Structure 1
Amino acid sequence: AKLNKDAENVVKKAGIDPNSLTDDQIKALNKMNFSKAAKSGTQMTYNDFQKIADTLIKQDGRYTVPFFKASEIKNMPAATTKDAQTNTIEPLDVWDSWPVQDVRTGQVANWNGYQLVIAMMGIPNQNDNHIYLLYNKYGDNELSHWKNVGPIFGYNSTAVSQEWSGSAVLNSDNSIQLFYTRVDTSDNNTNHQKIASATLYLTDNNGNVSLAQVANDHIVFEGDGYYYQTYDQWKATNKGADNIAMRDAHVIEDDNGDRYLVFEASTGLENYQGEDQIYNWLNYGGDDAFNIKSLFRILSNDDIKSRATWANAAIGILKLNKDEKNPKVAELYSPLISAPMVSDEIERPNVVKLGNKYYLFAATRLNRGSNDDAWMNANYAVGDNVAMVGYVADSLTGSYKPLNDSGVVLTASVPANWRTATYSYYAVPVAGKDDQVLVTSYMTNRNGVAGKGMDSTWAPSFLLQINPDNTTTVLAKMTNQGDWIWDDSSENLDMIGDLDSAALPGERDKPVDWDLIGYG
């Protein structure tokens, strides 16, 4: 019935009369740990997440993904191809994709006059998660000119061993070092994820690129238990509320010759998920009134309490050894970003060097966050809850600080079941500029949610201005679908839509897809 002095201090700083509190509220407040020491890097706080959501709800043009003219959007021809699992030619969903990049600068690599992209594809509504190599003439702006070489790990594949996202760069001899996620589903169909690497040797014969050989395929890392959550840790306590993530490895080398992977994971025992996290003041990150209001809200609702108990998404970093073609872990670090209490999924981490700063971007679905009100309000306002977040550091393993106050960079602008819905935003540098990136993404959500034969395809790309004061601004500068290389000739202002033209006829009267957007 009686507050400790720390708790009475914050209550009073908050303008709350201590007498107004219940016995349960006092008990909650007396458990609060007020230590301000950071454990797993810079945190996305409960306050940050709330602000990201508020920004999405405001639909402010500085951050909204631009409207795309829905009438211009088409399936990717190269996504009609021989399927890795059925061995039959099918119209596939294509989603997460990444270009072969220069390991230092991030620029889309020119390989013998070609640009190369690696992409997740599969038959809508099947478990069919494999990666395919794609190519086009360097600088070419036509979606339909892209060509599918085929599944990197071959035909006769199955759902028992899958490939999820990662990254790709050129080695010294112009072979390709692929980083990807090896997913083994033999332990009761669980998505046992592992960061893996292999070397791709290609050949160039009369306008066609072929995959000659996949060499050195091996597991690089799958978690240590202290910095990053292991499969065994997740399996031990999972009753269905805990996410598992060890994926989306992004390779980057700095000017000291050190090569690193920046990847998606969860924290380990360094700062682990648990109900205790609801009682760490550091996680809240607002003023006293906000923090107290937030604590009571979390404890008032079983689903928010549960999400908070299980949330501990991390963007990890490790240093590799020197061996380009057979990378192994040389050193592990604490997470660059973590979201204990706040979110259990932050995806596709990406580092772009611009000038002498390192910009760390990532995609996230706010409905993987603990604050149900915030993301259910996002859904109600826009029909979706996706975002790109961003941070910036002066060195690769340095302290990352959020952009635009809260870390918000892009916010959803259309309902998740529309043709022009986007996700898996991936920023790529622009030749000759240190203050813009080109944002790529996949368009149309998977598995036919936008209707008959509306496959996931490549979005038109758009420019994002990076300002020197750790802010960003979306530009009204757009390409054709599937353009990875911005230049003067790449602009197609005809692809720009507005509120009205972002929908195909009928889409406005279409029912909500609730499994897609979530509901607390």
Structure 2
Amino acid sequence: QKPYKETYGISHITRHDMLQIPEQQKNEKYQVPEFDSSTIKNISSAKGLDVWDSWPLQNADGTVANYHGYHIVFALAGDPKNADDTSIYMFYQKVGETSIDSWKNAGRVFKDSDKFDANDSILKDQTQEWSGSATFTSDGKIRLFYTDFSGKHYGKQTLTTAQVNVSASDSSLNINGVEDYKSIFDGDGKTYQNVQQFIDEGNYSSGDNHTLRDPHYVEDKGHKYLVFEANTGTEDGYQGEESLFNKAYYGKSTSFFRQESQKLLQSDKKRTAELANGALGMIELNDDYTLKKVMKPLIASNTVTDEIARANVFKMNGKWYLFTDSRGSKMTIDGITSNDIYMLGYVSNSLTGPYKPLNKTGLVLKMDLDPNDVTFTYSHFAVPQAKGNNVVITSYMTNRGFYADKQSTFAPSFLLNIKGKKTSVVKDSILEQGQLTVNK
């Protein structure tokens, strides 16, 4: 096919920027710090469960919420023997506490019967609960967003919401139940891929990776939004053979396009690149948390990867910062290995863009430890703070199902300094496992 150029009015993780990362990531400024394995404990209240992807109850601006004197963290958890066993649990600590042992376990957010009682057609076919966010409303309610995964329908993923009813006393929190439990968005075909388009390809046998998950709630000027992991649809630069000739996905120059595109077309990664159309999508919600407006993606990753996860966005000191986690094993970029794991980041003067790369390339964090390493971390998440130039990076530690005595747990948190369009890991800033704030 003939070369063309089309941005679709959105930002892009370009091949040229990603190719700069292999050399850049040797700089300790952009490296997840080494952790000390002999300080690492299992979450004592989680009782033999793997606990991975986690997120704090957040205020509208992303700072950590105070629920009746408690911090609350939602986390995926399940049997280490069963990789398809995933439910959201709610942990909580008193404000002031920092030890991993301070985290009590209120149990699952949902009963099995909740999805049926919701009178929601998609929800009644759910088989797993995957990641999202949680915001603390102005009328004092815990408002959860998460991913409804259905294994019965070829891995359908649906952005979902519920209010979690929680009684608070001097000693404990107790989940009483949920309400307003409903599907919000399952893709539209034109902006964000839906599950039927995945099935059109031949589902899992095709090599395609359909995502519509990890919704993150944020507000600006009283407007409510979710920003989430997705994939592009037919009208904002879809996957396919033709996608490899779109110079917007390469950047730099036409000379770089010709060279990189012909290399890619001759490589064993041609098909992978064709299928790769990850996106950080966006929708506006109404005041009852239903869908107001499908919006254009903030950024896309055509040709480089199909999987940019754990969308996160917030305002900090007059600028908007947009983050995503991604595995080098699923990328098509020379020099990036299957061991490499990233938090990528971008910056704008507005929530809705346009976003340009942090640290010139997109690199913020790199982690490349062996999957077998007990101190392996993934799912890095920047928790904004009330004031200052630091955010707190949370992550989970130790791969799921790897070790009988060492489960997936809260990683030691650490600090990331952010100023303008640059970031750096703060020297020797390792905090307690699962610590959410600098202030104690």
TM-score by length of 2: 0.93
1:71 deviates by 1.3
- Structure 2 residue 263 is matched with structure 1 residue 297: yes
1:334 deviates by 1.2
> Could you tell me which residue of structure 2 aligns to residue 179 of structure 1?
145
1:144 deviates by 0.8
> Could you tell me which residue of structure 2 aligns to residue 472 of structure 1?
423
- Structure 2 residue 320 is matched with structure 1 residue 320: no
> Could you tell me which residue of structure 1 aligns to residue 119 of structure 2?
none
1:432 deviates by 2.3
Aligned partners of 2:274, 2:229: CA distance in 1, in Å? 19
Code of the aligned partner of 1:436: N
- Structure 2 residue 25 is matched with structure 1 residue 33: no
1:287 deviates by 4.0
- Structure 2 residue 109 is matched with structure 1 residue 152: yes
Contact map agreement 1:321 1:328 (CA 8 A) in 2: yes
Aligned partners of 2:145, 2:4: CA distance in 1, in Å? 40
**Corresponding residue to 2:185 among 212, 221, 235:** 221
**Corresponding residue to 1:48 among 17, 21, 46:** 17
Code of the aligned partner of 1:63: Y
Aligned partners of 1:355, 1:385: CA distance in 2, in Å? 30
> Could you tell me which residue of structure 1 aligns to residue 36 of structure 2?
69
What SS is found at the alignment partner of 2:206? coil
> Could you tell me which residue of structure 2 aligns to residue 119 of structure 1?
75
Contact map agreement 1:67 1:413 (CA 8 A) in 2: no
Aligned partners of 2:126, 2:63: CA distance in 1, in Å? 34
1:288 deviates by 4.5
Q: Deviations over 1:347-391 (max 9, x none)?
A: 0010121022111111111211123x4333xx4xxxx21000111
Contact map agreement 1:436 1:465 (CA 8 A) in 2: yes
- Structure 2 residue 130 is matched with structure 1 residue 164: yes
> Could you tell me which residue of structure 2 aligns to residue 108 of structure 1?
64
Aligned 1:399-478 pairs, distance under 5 A: 399-433=354-388, 435-448=389-402, 451-468=403-420, 470-476=421-427, 477-478=429-430
Which one is further off, 386-395 or 234-243? 234-243
1:293 deviates by 2.9
1:174 deviates by 1.3
Aligned partners of 1:306, 1:79: CA distance in 2, in Å? 41
What SS is found at the alignment partner of 2:200? helix
Contact map agreement 1:241 1:307 (CA 8 A) in 2: yes
1:423 deviates by 0.6
Aligned partners of 1:370, 1:307: CA distance in 2, in Å? 7
Q: Deviations over 1:117-143 (max 9, x none)?
A: 100001113020110011110121010
Aligned partners of 2:246, 2:67: CA distance in 1, in Å? 50
**Corresponding residue to 1:265 among 230, 235, 260:** 230
Contact map agreement 1:40 1:338 (CA 8 A) in 2: no
Aligned partners of 2:22, 2:195: CA distance in 1, in Å? 31
Code of the aligned partner of 1:467: K
**Corresponding residue to 1:332 among 269, 272, 294:** 294
Contact map agreement 2:126 2:148 (CA 8 A) in 1: no
1:201 deviates by 1.2
What SS is found at the alignment partner of 1:352? strand
TM-score by length of 1: 0.79
What SS is found at the alignment partner of 1:460? coil
How many pairs align?
426
Aligned partners of 1:410, 1:64: CA distance in 2, in Å? 5
Q: CA RMSD in A?
A: 1.8
Contact map agreement 2:110 2:177 (CA 8 A) in 1: no
Code of the aligned partner of 1:233: Q
What SS is found at the alignment partner of 2:301? strand
Aligned partners of 1:69, 1:337: CA distance in 2, in Å? 36
Code of the aligned partner of 1:124: P
Code of the aligned partner of 2:409: T
Code of the aligned partner of 2:435: D
Aligned partners of 2:33, 2:287: CA distance in 1, in Å? 41
> Could you tell me which residue of structure 1 aligns to residue 118 of structure 2?
none
Code of the aligned partner of 1:134: F
What SS is found at the alignment partner of 1:109? coil
- Which structure has the larger Rg? 1
Contact map agreement 2:143 2:164 (CA 8 A) in 1: yes
Aligned partners of 1:284, 1:133: CA distance in 2, in Å? 42
Aligned partners of 2:191, 2:314: CA distance in 1, in Å? 24
Contact map agreement 2:132 2:213 (CA 8 A) in 1: yes
Code of the aligned partner of 1:414: L
Aligned partners of 2:248, 2:437: CA distance in 1, in Å? 41
Distance 1:53 1:130, change over 3 A: farther
Task: Using the aligned pairs only, state the percent identity.
Answer: 39
What SS is found at the alignment partner of 1:363? strand
What SS is found at the alignment partner of 1:282? helix
What SS is found at the alignment partner of 1:297? helix
**Corresponding residue to 2:335 among 359, 369, 374:** 374
1:32 deviates by 3.7
Contact map agreement 1:245 1:266 (CA 8 A) in 2: yes
Contact map agreement 1:200 1:214 (CA 8 A) in 2: yes
Aligned partners of 2:206, 2:398: CA distance in 1, in Å? 28
What SS is found at the alignment partner of 2:360? coil
1:399 deviates by 0.7
Q: Deviations over 1:400-430 (max 9, x none)?
A: 1110111110011422220111110010112
Aligned partners of 1:155, 1:220: CA distance in 2, in Å? 20
- Structure 2 residue 52 is matched with structure 1 residue 95: yes
Aligned partners of 1:134, 1:362: CA distance in 2, in Å? 24
**Corresponding residue to 2:348 among 385, 389, 393:** 393
Code of the aligned partner of 1:480: E
